[PDB]
Amino acid sequence: MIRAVFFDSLGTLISVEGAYKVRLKIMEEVLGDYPLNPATLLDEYEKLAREAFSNYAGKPYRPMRDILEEVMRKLAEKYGFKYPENLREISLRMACRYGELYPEVVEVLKSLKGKYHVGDILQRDTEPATAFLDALGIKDLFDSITTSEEAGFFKPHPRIFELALKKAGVKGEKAVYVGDNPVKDAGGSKNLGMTSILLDRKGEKREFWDKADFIVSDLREVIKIVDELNG
Ligand SMILES: [Cl-]
Numbered sequence: 274m275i276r277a278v279f280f281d282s283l284g285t286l287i288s289v290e291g292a293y294k295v296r297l298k299i300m301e302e303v304l305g306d307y308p309l310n311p312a313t314l315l316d317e318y319e320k321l322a323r324e325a326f327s328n329y330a331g332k333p334y335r336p337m338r339d340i341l342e343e344v345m346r347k348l349a350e351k352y353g354f355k356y357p358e359n360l361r362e363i364s365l366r367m368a369c370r371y372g373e374l375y376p377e378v379v380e381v382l383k384s385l386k387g388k389y390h391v392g393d394i395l396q397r398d399t400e401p402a403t404a405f406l407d408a409l410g411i412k413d414l415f416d417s418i419t420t421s422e423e424a425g426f427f428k429p430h431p432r433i434f435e436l437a438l439k440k441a442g443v444k445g446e447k448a449v450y451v452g453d454n455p456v457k458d459a460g461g462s463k464n465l466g467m468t469s470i471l472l473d474r475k476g477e478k479r480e481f482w483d484k485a486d487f488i489v490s491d492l493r494e495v496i497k498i499v500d501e502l503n504g
Pocket of ligand 1: 398
């Protein structure tokens with residue numbers, strides 16, 4: 274039977290408008306009156322971030338805040354603005370202020386928490402990630418929160434999933450993983466026997482549906498999938 278349901282909250286439960294706005298507001302704060310369009314800085318930042326993290330996939334963990342500060346140092350050098358001090362404080366304040374959940378998230382976590390181990394699996398430094406979940410109001414709705422910093426390796430390394438399963442006290446065949454990227458999950462979670470649910474809210478990942486056991490566009494579908502897997 275299914276006894277655990279794992280999510281990737283900061284990645285499958287944060288609205289796209291909210292996440293973009295958090296990041297835009299960070300760039301606006303970094304730049305102040307410097308004459309660079311914050312949306313261009315954000316685009317360039319995202320590119321470099323993705324690159325830098327690509328170099329780390331599967332590798333031993335390194336604080337992501339350190340990685341993102343190195344990226345921002347390159348952007349400051351590129352565009353000529355002064356490197357912002359206390360970038361991680363700016364980022365945490367903006368996340369807590371403008372972060373926003375998809376509308377059905379709280380209901381789905383509450384409905385599941387009574388009958389399953391409800392877990393979060395996050396590739397984020399544990400301290401800011403947990404503060405963000407606290408600010409979003411959902412930290413205590415999870416039975417467990419597991420991070421790459423705790424596991425010691427970046428996805429798709431499976432250690433993060435192994436640790437999340439240990440916290441739930443079950444082997445992977447008893448668990449579902451809800452994610453939005455079947456790359457970091459299939460190379461890690463499918464090896465452990467977990468059932469993968471791909472969240473594709475706008476039907477834009479059809480070329481990756483084959484790497485998922487189920488596809489949903491609304492998180493309320495997850496409850497039905499698991500209740501039936503158990504019926
Ligand atoms: Cl982080």
